[PDB]
Amino acid sequence: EPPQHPRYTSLFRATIKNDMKKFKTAMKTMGP
Amino acid sequence: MRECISIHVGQAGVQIGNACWELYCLEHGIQPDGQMPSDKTIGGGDDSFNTFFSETGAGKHVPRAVFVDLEPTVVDEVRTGTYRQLFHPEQLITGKEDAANNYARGHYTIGKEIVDLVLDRIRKLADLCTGLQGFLIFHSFGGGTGSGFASLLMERLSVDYGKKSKLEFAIYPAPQVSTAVVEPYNSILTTHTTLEHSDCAFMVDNEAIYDICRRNLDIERPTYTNLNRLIGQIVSSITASLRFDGALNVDLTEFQTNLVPYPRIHFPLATYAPVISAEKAYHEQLSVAEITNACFEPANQMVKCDPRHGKYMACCMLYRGDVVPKDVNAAIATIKTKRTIQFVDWCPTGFKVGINYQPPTVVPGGDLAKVQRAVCMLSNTTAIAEAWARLDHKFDLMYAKRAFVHWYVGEGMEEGEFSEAREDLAALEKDYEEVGVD
Amino acid sequence: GCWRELLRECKEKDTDKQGTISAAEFLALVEKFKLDISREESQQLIVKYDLKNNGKFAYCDFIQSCVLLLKAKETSLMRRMRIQNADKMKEAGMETPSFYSALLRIQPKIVHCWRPMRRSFKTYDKNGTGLLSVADFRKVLRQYSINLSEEEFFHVLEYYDKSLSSKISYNDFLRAFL
Amino acid sequence: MREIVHLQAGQCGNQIGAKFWEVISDEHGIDPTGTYHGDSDLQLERINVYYNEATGGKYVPRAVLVDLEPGTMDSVRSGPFGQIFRPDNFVFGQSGAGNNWAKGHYTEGAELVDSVLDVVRKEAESCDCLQGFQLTHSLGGGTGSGMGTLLISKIREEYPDRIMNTFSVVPSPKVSDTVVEPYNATLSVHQLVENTDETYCIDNEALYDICFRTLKLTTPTYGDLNHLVSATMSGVTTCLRFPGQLNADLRKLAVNMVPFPRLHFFMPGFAPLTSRGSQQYRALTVPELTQQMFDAKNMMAACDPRHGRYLTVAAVFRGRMSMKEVDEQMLNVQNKNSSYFVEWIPNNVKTAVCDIPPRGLKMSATFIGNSTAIQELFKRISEQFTAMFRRKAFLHWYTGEGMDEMEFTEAESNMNDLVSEYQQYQD
Amino acid sequence: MREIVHLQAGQCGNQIGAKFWEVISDEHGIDPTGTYHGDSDLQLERINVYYNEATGGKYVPRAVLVDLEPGTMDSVRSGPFGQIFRPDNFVFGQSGAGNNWAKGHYTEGAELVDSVLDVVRKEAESCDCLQGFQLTHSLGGGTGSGMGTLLISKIREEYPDRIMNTFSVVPSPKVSDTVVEPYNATLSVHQLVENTDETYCIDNEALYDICFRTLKLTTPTYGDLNHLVSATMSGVTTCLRFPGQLNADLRKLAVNMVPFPRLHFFMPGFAPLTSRGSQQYRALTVPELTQQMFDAKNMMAACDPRHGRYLTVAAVFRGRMSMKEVDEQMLNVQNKNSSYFVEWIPNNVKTAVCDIPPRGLKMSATFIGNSTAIQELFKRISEQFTAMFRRKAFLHWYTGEGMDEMEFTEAESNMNDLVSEYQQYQD
Amino acid sequence: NYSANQYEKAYLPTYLQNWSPARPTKEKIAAHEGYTQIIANDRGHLLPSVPRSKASPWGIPPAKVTLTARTTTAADNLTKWIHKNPDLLNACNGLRPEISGKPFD
Amino acid sequence: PFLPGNSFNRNIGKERFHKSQHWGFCNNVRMLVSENKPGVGGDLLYG
Ligand SMILES: Nc1nc2c(ncn2[C@@H]2O[C@H](COP(=O)(O)OP(=O)(O)OP(=O)(O)O)[C@@H](O)[C@H]2O)c(=O)[nH]1
Ligand SMILES: Nc1nc2c(ncn2[C@@H]2O[C@H](COP(=O)(O)OP(=O)(O)OP(=O)(O)O)[C@@H](O)[C@H]2O)c(=O)[nH]1
Ligand SMILES: Nc1nc2c(ncn2[C@@H]2O[C@H](COP(=O)(O)OP(=O)(O)OP(=O)(O)O)[C@@H](O)[C@H]2O)c(=O)[nH]1
């Protein structure tokens, strides 16, 4: 049984999640 | 190819068969000689006429019709008249006696010895028939003689063939007008002997044909000539799909499916909107929205029925001339949005639409206008209870007194037929009604 | 939890087929979980299902009739009843859910993905003809991760078979649970 | 080499295949007769995508027309480009359908499938390698469905390795013309969803609406609407037959588009279509293209995924472009609409760029989208079924043809499956 | 780049849009067709801040126009410039407002809000970077007031970072044409105060008084009145689109003008107006331009700022000048009346020096002031409000729309609070 | 009878020139279930057990008004003088007028 | 050009509209009735 490596936080993780989050900003601005 | 047969029974019929073919030669450009002018379309009888004629190397178009009558008068008249050289002498079948307003006289006393010739001529045309989609059978209900005869010959052809269409036209009993006290009898007899083999029967009331003929035709002394041009225009409209092309095309089998929901009932009603004179039209406009509204005005139906008290089950709209699907669908949407019209909760859609580029024609001496848009509306609705209700109450009272029984029993029938007819119509009332129940 | 929670409530007990569970200890199950049944109805129940297989209460038929079994149709989409009656008719193995404890244990897969398996049956060229081979039956069950022990195979074989091989209609299986 | 044979069914298929073939012929610049005018060597070379050679420089289209009523085909023959099609691929029936799906599906097709299979496989052998076929047809319009059901049914196992692309017209939500069209529709869509890979759904109401919004001409014909749809046809088919830094294979597109086997329904797009004054009132640049194309109203299939959320989007542009403007536009629209796309998958957008435009306009495009905007179409049709089969109205004919309500019930169950399947994944 | 999107609402904006756009166009020297002629290199450079550039030197005005009465639209269409506007932007309706505030705020706009927001979003995306928008309307007129009240409330949450400047004509202190006008005004200002950052007050009476005092020309037109107000608007926008050692930004101006968020109304002012002979009897110099700018007669918004005391002022000087002379001019007036200036802040003037003049006169200027001179308008409208509401007359239409007076309560209360806070600060 | 979608400007009394509103339309329905079993026989005769709307329909004092301020008792009378006419309150195009208004003091 | 919207159909005076019968079945096969046919209302074919 090989243990899957703890997905290394090469930074990113929730940080890159918030990064892409703060570009995904225009939600409604073309069709309401 | 795309072709059908034409059948006319009775003095009641050869009338308007004459009218119809009188028209049908004009728009296609035939001279009453029967040979085409210096221009060239003659041959084995295959050009647009071919759906109604076979102008073989003989050189003459021949209508694909049979005129069967019990009485020599009218057939002799039309033989001596104008169009005999077109006409084919013996398919003008004539008899020696009249059914004398007796359904059983027409069904037993005479029917046996002439149906043989009828069917023989039918088959000797059917052999050359190729497409033979269906028939145009013309008869009546308050028939002087044609009623029982048509019923029995229809039985013969319905049992010999059962894989095609049959179209039925009969002037409906005038509500409060009678030319026969035996009219309720012979009508209901035809009804219960034909309810189970026919395909599509459409009605009309010549009282109302008159009533529009002085509402907007603007004559206080019309004639049968005027009534017959109107109805001939109707038949021309229904056959225009065969005769010409367009964006989209529809057929009789589509009619028989789409209009009637169920067996038994197959009795919708017709209407024609732009019935208008040249003098009236001179300074007014014609177009899709108002012609639709006019064709759905409650008093422009030529049979005494109320949209308001009725409820719709089907509508088919047949447009001829120069139109566009845009305003077509716009008008139909307005129709759906209207409130006075009350469709039953059954039909989500309710409208079979067909279009042809070709504007109808006129006839010299004719009294229609020079119109550019034509619509034929065929509707099935619950508004027709009153007709058969009137018929049954009249019949039940005068059968309770049971006169003219002596006539029928003496000629050799009995009352059991009457009993069956009564229970049939008693069924049909609630048949119309619980389907409306929703 | 009328299905899976009660399934585990049944699993808590350990006694044989005929000795399903004592009526007093099933009343103890009631006090562990008060039930949507009425008091007089439960008073009936504790003997109406001790009628069969000893004075023990029959969760055996109780659970499966209440949730799993349905020997009728549904006007409001039981999702198929695709009209088929071949193997439920002969049915050498009369419905005996204790002898059919497999069905007591295989429900979740079907109750969530009958429709993919509903599809899968006809996907093997069934042509709407009804029955289809026992071998294909078994292999497609193993295909979609429905493991099934040989004793369970024999149970359901007797249930949906009397005479010979036959080909057991798919809806003729489905109406059991679905 | 690989090529496409065309299947044209029903009186809508007649319509659109006629205008469509003349469109393609004029696209490659062939006279209505068949004697070629040499202008563009690349378009001369790529003829073999569709055309089989005839001696002395004349070029047949490898298409098969089929219907029942002869007069429709007679009119098509009389049309401006009739002479281009062959007596060989002209075959039809001796009766009319009456738009009776039962009659077409079992009665009449049974005795013409032999000849139609014969002719299509003859053309297949005449050719060398095939990707698949495309059929043009209706689903509520009777005859086309009544034949195409069996057509696809057989061709499915005749070639389990090819691509069965189909274009069908869809009933109008406001007025469906033929009353039995819903019944015909469900009967078709069962086998359609079971068999096909891809399906294109369009309706004529939206075409009306685009006509009034940009054509402004108030007096079009069904032929003009066919012109639009056949232009979209050609637009998607462009890449195979032309050089460019982009992929062409219908498979290369489908594998990107469809995530799960049950998804087979797709939803078109068109590029700046120019009104009377907009010719000189539009600034023709890629940003405003991107906008006008991916406008919600600019869509024309059924109804706006405005309610729902986009799953996959593909766009093929045609003309002299650069990559970076479309790149920045893709990122702009991606940020512009994140909710309408699913965190399920980012970068659900695929593009392609082919160099040669159509003739006369500078840069154009064609859009295709798969989103959660189709639920309501068959939702609609499903309420019609629940309402009219509530009383077996108009069903005696089908009973007489020999059918049973079974056949309808399995279809309704399948369609419910699809509806729930959408809603579940998209949420 | 930072640009503007221009909005016209109501049957006043109907004219002001025409006059203002023709002012900009003939200032930039483009023919009534739109084909550009190179005259002023620099204005050609900066044209992008207002116009978009089509192909071939054609220039659309990014103006969006809304109305319910299409006849005035017909007139604007017919005018000598109307062909310059795009049909892509003419959003309107089917009926009129009936000059009802309740109707124009709830019923008729409910079905045009969609399209108006769609056009504005299209243009907002099309453009690059926005400072904000300017809205021409009239609080005294119904239709524009209703549409404006709705649209500004929406755009506040749409784009919460920008400058939503509004210009309007407050009704006459002597006769208001419209009789339910005070209701219209109170209900309009109730949302005006919350939403707008800046609003200009103008009065047609004061326009008439200007015509009497300086124009002397007897027979004017409403077009000429619009000419004067267009001069004012052009003046306030002069700074952005040209070079110069001055701070153009409207936000420059806003933070420099407004001490507190409850102060948004401002009073226009224009510079030398000459009579028929004063052109050649008036030696044109800085001290006399300044003196005429600071007149009890030049000022034309509502009434003399004599009653109250000034709070702040901003002046823009357009032409060839020096800065020192305006410096000692403000010194002179500062010492002249240091008693009328507030003691909260010293030296309450912002001066800006635009270089390129208006064509026709060497030097020019413009004035925008904020003083304790609004009590008159709002007090008077308050008494008229209370008088006509002391028997709830004309309330039947509003209640028939569905409108109750509980809202009128907080409306009138808010105007009372604004007046009271004015008093509290200035005294 | 149900409404269309999105393209909601080209289908209105705006083009009917209707001045009596058409019908309450909608785009609002959940996924219906049921195989739609059959309760008719050959004609539209429902089976007796299953119910229908059992022929509930089978087949001037009114004036739109805002109460506003007309004498209180007259307003109370006007309420009845508007209603109590189900014949012109029920069906045959609905035949339904509205009400607005405020009470007195 | 034949781009969409470039076809302003010949929607002017069109009195005749009759359609030929260009195809038939005949005996027991199907083929094209003798080639020489009028077009729509008397049109002439290609060459
Ligand atoms: N077809 C047709 N019907 C007409 C005409 N004029 C009146 N009618 C109606 O058609 C019916 C004609 O039926 P009958 O008079 O019984 O004709 P018949 O049954 O063939 O036999 P006869 O008694 O000899 O006339 C009448 O009831 C009239 O209401 C007409 O010219 N043609
Ligand atoms: N050429 C042509 N086709 C059209 C036109 N308008 C509509 N169509 C479509 O053609 C559709 C169906 O094509 P087919 O499959 O050939 O029709 P079908 O199977 O014979 O059944 P029907 O639609 O009843 O004719 C119809 O439903 C129409 O929607 C048109 O104007 N011209
Ligand atoms: N176009 C135009 N507007 C004028 C004229 N004279 C005065 N106005 C002003 O225009 C103002 C209102 O413009 P809108 O916002 O369009 O008015 P509205 O919403 O239609 O309401 P009403 O003013 O009652 O018509 C009024 O307050 C008038 O003072 C004129 O001659 N032409």
Residue numbers in the entry:
A (entry chain L3): 20 to 51
B (entry chain MG): 1 to 438
C (entry chain Q2): 1338 to 1515
D (entry chain MH), E (entry chain LH): 1 to 427
F (entry chain O2): 4 to 62, 74 to 119
G (entry chain G5): 4 to 50
Task: Give the text the authors published on this PDB structure.
The dynein motors are responsible for driving sperm movement and fine-tuning motility, while the MIPs provide the major stabilizing force for the DMT architecture. In this study, by using an integrative method of cryo-focused ion beam (cryo-FIB) milling, cryo-ET and STA, artificial intelligence (AI)-assisted modeling, and mass spectrometry (MS), we resolved the in-cell structure of mouse sperm axoneme DMT, achieving an overall resolution of 4.5–6.5 Å in 16 nm repeats and 6.5–7.5 Å in 48 nm repeats, and built the 16 nm and 48 nm repeat models. In addition to α- and β-tubulins, we identified and modeled 36 different kinds of MIPs in our intact mouse sperm DMT reconstruction.
The A-tubule was resolved at an overall resolution of 4.5 Å with the local resolution up to 3.6 Å in DMTF16, and an overall resolution of ~6.5 Å in DMTF48. At the high-resolution region of DMTF16 map, well-defined side-chain densities of distinguishable residues facilitated accurate assignment and modeling of multiple MIPs. Interestingly, Tektin5 seems to form an additional bundle itself. ENKUR that has an extremely elongated configuration connects the protofilaments A12, A13, and B10 in every 16 nm repeat, and participates in the inter-protofilament interactions of B-tubule.
